[PDB]
Write a protein that binds this ligand. Structure first.
Ligand code: HEM
Ligand SMILES: Cc1ccc(N)c[n+]1C
Length: 292
C-alpha cells in the first residue's frame, strides 16, 4: 500500500556511484585481516540482504528503500548480530560521500562485495531515500535457520521469491562463515571462502554430511572437509523441487551467476517504484577492470 518512489541523489550520475563503488572496493582490499583474513566481503553481502529482507509485499513495509538499519530497533535485531561490523566498514565511505542515501550505500556495499569477490555483475539502481525512525520495521521478519524446506518456501513468498530465486540466492552461503556468538552456529573455520563461486551447490551434493550439535546446542550439518550447512541450507537437497535446481547450479556456473544476479538485484529493489524516466541500472566496473 505504501509507495516509495526512487529519487536520484541531486545531480548525481553513473560516475559518482562508480567512485563510491571504488572506495568500497579499495577498502575491501585494504582491510584484509577482518575475520581471520576472510575480509569484509561476505558480511557486506549479508548486510545488503538483511536490510532488504525485512520487506513485506503485502503492505510494502520494510525493504532497502528507507535505510532504516541506521536506527537502533533494526541495528539491534538479534537477526542482525554481527552486521555492525559491515556498518562500521561503510561509515568512512558515507563520510566521504555524505550525499548517498543509507539504503543506496548498504545495497551498493553488497553489489560491490559480490563483484570484487569475482561474482557476477549485479546491475544496481540509485534513488533510495532515507525515511524516519518510525518507518523502521519490527524485529522478526528475517528467517530462522533451524527450519525445513516448507518453512523456507513459505518465508520467501513474502519477498516475492520463487523456488529458483530462493535456491539461487542461497548460493551466497558459499561466502564467509557462521559465528557462534552471532547466530548460534559455527563454521567453517579453515574451509571458509571469500571468492564467489557455485561451490555451495557442489558441497551440498558431494560432501558426506553429518547432523551434529554445536557448542550452542543447535543442530547443523558438518562435513569431514570442514564445511557446514544450516538446516535450512540442507533442506534444499531434502525437497525434490529444490534438489533439481541445486543440481542445475552445481552443473552450470554461468547459469548460477546469471540467476543470482537477477535475484539479488530484485531483492535489493523490492518495494521501490522507479519512475519511467529514471536512469537505467548501472553496471559498475571492478577495480581489476579499471586497472586500479
Ligand atoms: C533461509 C534463509 C537464510 C537463513 C536462515 C540464513 C541464515 C544465516 C546465518 C545464521 C548466518 C550466520 C551469521 C553469523 O553467525 O555471523 C548467515 C550468514 C550469511 N548469510 Fe545467510 N541466511 C539466509 C539467506 C541468505 C541470503 C538470501 C543471503 C544473500 C543472498 C545470505 C548471505 C549470507 C552471507 C554472505 C553470510 C556470511 C556472513 C559472514 O561471513 O559474516 N543469507 N546466514
Ligand atoms: C549460513 C551460512 C553462512 C556462511 C557459510 N559459509 C555457510 N552457511 C551455512
Amino acid at each position: 500500500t505504501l509507495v516509495h518512489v526512487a529519487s536520484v541523489e541531486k545531480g548525481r550520475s553513473y560516475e559518482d556511484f562508480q567512485k563510491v563503488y571504488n572506495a568500497i572496493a579499495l577498502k575491501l582490499r585494504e582491510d584484509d585481516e577482518y575475520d581471520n583474513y576472510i575480509g569484509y566481503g561476505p558480511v557486506l553481502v549479508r548486510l545488503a540482504w538483511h536490510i532488504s529482507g525485512t520487506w513485506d509485499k503485502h503492505d510494502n513495509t520494510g525493504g532497502s528503500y528507507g535505510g532504516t538499519y541506521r536506527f537502533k530497533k533494526e541495528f539491534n535485531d538479534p537477526s542482525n548480530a554481527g552486521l555492525q561490523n559491515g556498518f562500521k566498514f561503510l561509515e568512512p565511505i558515507h563520510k566521504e560521500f555524505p550525499w548517498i542515501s543509507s539504503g543506496d550505500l548498504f545495497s551498493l556495499g553488497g553489489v560491490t562485495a559480490v563483484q570484487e569477490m569475482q561474482g557476477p555483475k549485479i546491475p544496481w539502481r540509485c534513488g533510495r531515500v532515507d525515511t524516519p525512525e518510525d518507518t523502521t520495521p519490527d524485529n522478526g521478519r528475517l528467517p530462522d535457520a533451524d527450519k525445513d524446506a516448507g518453512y523456507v518456501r513459505t518465508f520467501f513468498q513474502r519477498l516475492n521469491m520463487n523456488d529458483r530465486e530462493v535456491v539461487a540466492l542461497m548460493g551466497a552461503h558459499a561466502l564467509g562463515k557462521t559465528h557462534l556468538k552471532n547466530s548460534g552456529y559455527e563454521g567453517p573455520g579453515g574451509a571458509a571462502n571469500n571468492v564467489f563461486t557455485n561451490e555451495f551447490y557442489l558441497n551440498l551434493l558431494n560432501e558426506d554430511w553429518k547432523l551434529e550439535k554445536n557448542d550452542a546446542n543447535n543442530e547443523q550439518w558438518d562435513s569431514k572437509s570442514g564445511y557446514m550447512m544450516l538446516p535450512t541450507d540442507y533442506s534444499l537437497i531434502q525437497d525434490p523441487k529444490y534438489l533439481s535446481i541445486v543440481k542445475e547450479y552445481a552443473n552450470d556456473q554461468d547459469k548460477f551467476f546469471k540467476d543470482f544476479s537477477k535475484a539479488f538485484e530484485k531483492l535489493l529493489e523490492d518495494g521501490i517504484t522507479f519512475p519511467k524516466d529514471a536512469p537505467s541500472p548501472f553496471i559498475f566496473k571492478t577495480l581489476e577492470e579499471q586497472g586500479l
